[PDB]
């Protein structure tokens, strides 16, 4: 065993690794893979390069690379690409860990096919021969970083959104739903729109280029009507960003409507109902004693929820739903209703915190993991749940 | 329904 444990979240967009009992992750790198490519347009080789390169180096040298994403929505497309990424992160320059005497924690997305879990566990047991592994749900990995035994999670990130309400700790599987909206999609759409503006963009590397522009300029609104009238009546909200090549682009209206797809999936050809509406429906479909407790405690997890203004839009929408679908416009009784969105400052990384705290107290006792010994037997798997 | 269940 070696009393050594490393917690990782092999998600879709970014991959985080770190040791247990750590306040903040030691290493943070994204999931970028790309073979070398020469573009006849401009630029030539300047520094060293290798046939297969991944990690942070891609974020800096994507100019001469065919960057591709191995995972999206938390599902397996390219077995070899993920194998290469795992080899890289497990190499002596990213983690530098001994496979034969180490344990790991995995956080697979809720409501995913069992084939992905089976493949990943089999790969870890065979190719790298880890002594033991575990798989956990985001609910514990999130609620366990601040001491909450009840709440509703609106975890959103690259891939798809997910929800996993818990009341008094016990799980409520029959009240979880999935939607086909995430940051990648908000990106495809910043793109159709800046294309309209008249800029031609590819799907190889500029996809990563728009990431910073979305991070800085893109923001969500409070009221769609007021913001739209402001945009069409004024031009103060215009802003730009310096591209790596020095080119300058203007974006004043497209930076605002892209996040609106979250509350209006109709914009991107999805028969969705809206994050706030979905949350209200899920809460209502439950029992009664749990509705008030769920509303009182609610968390906004995931890096894709760091948009400025999302909590205000969500709370306003929820209050509107409560007013219209329950009180039929009776505002007087609506005053006492209370909501407190849980938005920790460390919303960029909270799952790693939960994994570290879990491994802090769940390391001494060996009856928690899928030990290597059980793998050699048949009639196996689904060890715990 | 109005109270309890949706309909």
């Amino acid at each position: 065993q070696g009393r050594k444990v490393v917690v990782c979240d092999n998600g879709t967009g970014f991959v985080k690794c770190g040791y247990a009992g750590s306040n903040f992750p030691e290493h943070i790198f994204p999931a970028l893979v790309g073979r070398p490519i020469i573009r006849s347009t401009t630029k030539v080789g300047n520094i060293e390069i290798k046939d297969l390169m991944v990690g942070d180096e891609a974020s800096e040298l994507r100019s001469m690379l065919e960057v591709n994403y191995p995972m999206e929505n938390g599902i397996v497309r390219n077995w070899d690409d993920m194998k290469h990424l795992w080899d890289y992160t497990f190499g002596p320059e990213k983690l530098n860990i001994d496979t034969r005497n180490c344990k790991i924690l995995l956080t697979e997305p809720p409501m995913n096919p069992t084939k992905n879990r089976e493949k990943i566990v089999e790969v870890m047991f065979e190719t790298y021969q880890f002594s033991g592994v575990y798989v956990a749900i985001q609910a514990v990995l999130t609620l366990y970083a601040q001491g909450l035994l009840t709440g509703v999670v609106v975890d959103s990130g690259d891939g798809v959104t997910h929800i996993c309400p818990v009341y008094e700790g016990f799980s409520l599987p029959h009240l979880t739903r999935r939607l086909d909206i995430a940051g990648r999609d908000i990106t495809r759409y910043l793109i159709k729109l800046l294309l309209l503006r008249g800029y031609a963009f590819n799907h190889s590397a500029d996809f990563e280029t728009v990431r910073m522009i979305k991070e800085k300029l893109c923001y969500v609104g409070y009221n769609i009507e007021q913001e739209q009238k402001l945009a069409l009546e004024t031009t103060v909200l215009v802003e730009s960003y310096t591209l790596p090549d020095g080119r300058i682009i203007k974006v004043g209206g497209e930076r605002f409507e892209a996040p609106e797809a979250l509350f209006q999936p109709h914009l991107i050809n999805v028969e969705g109902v809206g994050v706030a509406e979905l949350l209200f429906n899920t809460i209502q479909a439950a029992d009664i004693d749990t509705r008030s407790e769920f509303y009182k405690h609610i968390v906004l997890s995931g890096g894709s929820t760091m948009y400025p203004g999302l909590p205000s839009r969500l709370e306003r929408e929820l209050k509107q739903l409560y007013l219209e679908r329950v009180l039929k416009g009776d505002v007087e009784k609506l005053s006492k209703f209370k909501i407190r969105i849980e938005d920790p400052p460390r919303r960029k990384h909270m799952v790693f915190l939960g994994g570290a705290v879990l491994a802090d107290i769940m390391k001494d006792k060996d009856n928690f993991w899928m030990t290597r010994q059980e793998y050699q037997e048949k009639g196996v798997r689904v060890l715990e749940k | 329904w109005x109270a309890x269940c949706p309909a």
Partner: protein, 372 residues
Amino acid sequence: ETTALVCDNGSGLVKAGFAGDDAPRAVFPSIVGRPRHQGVMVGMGQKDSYVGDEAQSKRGILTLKYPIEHGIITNWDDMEKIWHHTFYNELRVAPEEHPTLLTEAPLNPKANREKMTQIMFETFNVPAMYVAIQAVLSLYASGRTTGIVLDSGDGVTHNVPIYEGYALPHAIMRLDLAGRDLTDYLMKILTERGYSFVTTAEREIVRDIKEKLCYVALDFENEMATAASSSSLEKSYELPDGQVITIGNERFRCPETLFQPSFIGMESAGIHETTYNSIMKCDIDIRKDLYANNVMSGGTTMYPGIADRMQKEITALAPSTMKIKIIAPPERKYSVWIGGSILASLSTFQQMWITKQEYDEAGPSIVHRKCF
């Protein structure tokens, strides 16, 4: 060995306390709930079984089941669990230190009594105990020796005519109708209004609603007509989720089931008819005394105006040449417990108890001959 404990295993609630106190020290409903979901979090291995106010608080994720149904126990494990909880967690008194007093409805199977006595003597090894009737304790609490008892509890309603220094076991009538049937009918009608309630949590919610916003009607037809002019009778209640429910005729409809059992489909008679039949079966001379004294007790008889309706019905049925009086003390909920405490405090009763030695030498059948 200075006092004794009196426990009333009510069909829907449990009352317990020390012998001598004027108020109970423990009042919690008889609920034995178990988790219904799977459970995911790891920092909790908590209490596979849940009892008492804890069960009421977290009823939203539990399958509440009442251990006692219509006065007869169905699950002995639940009853033993509730007994252990009340004895240890709440009272914090060891069974050996003091004896225990138990009460049960009349006309109950002997198997229940024998099993209860055996469990009490074997598991908790209580030094001594006794079995009594709620109605006689109601008489003791009321400080009277003659009358008729209307012990309309949550599970069973029964009457037991009494006279000075003696009872009439041949004129005892027991009716299965009780608060639970009223709650079921209330749920059914609330469905007809437009509000649906099925699970046990909403059962507790409807029970509270009935406890708070129900009353009896002096005249059914007149109340229905006034309901046709529904502008002064409807009332609103606030649900935990914040939804508001408006209740009209249902306030005075469900209680009428007591006087009209045909609503639920039971081929029986109302409480007034049963009491009239019981009193008629008695001797002629004691009929006057029974009419002059009518004690009622139980949690199902707190509806305002019930006493007036009962008086009117009895006077209409009875000859209109004497006076009929209804006595409605404002503390009838705990009358049984008060009577049990007073009986235990009696000096003469210190020898009527049943001890372990005589029980072991004789057997469980002894309790059968102990005051019937």
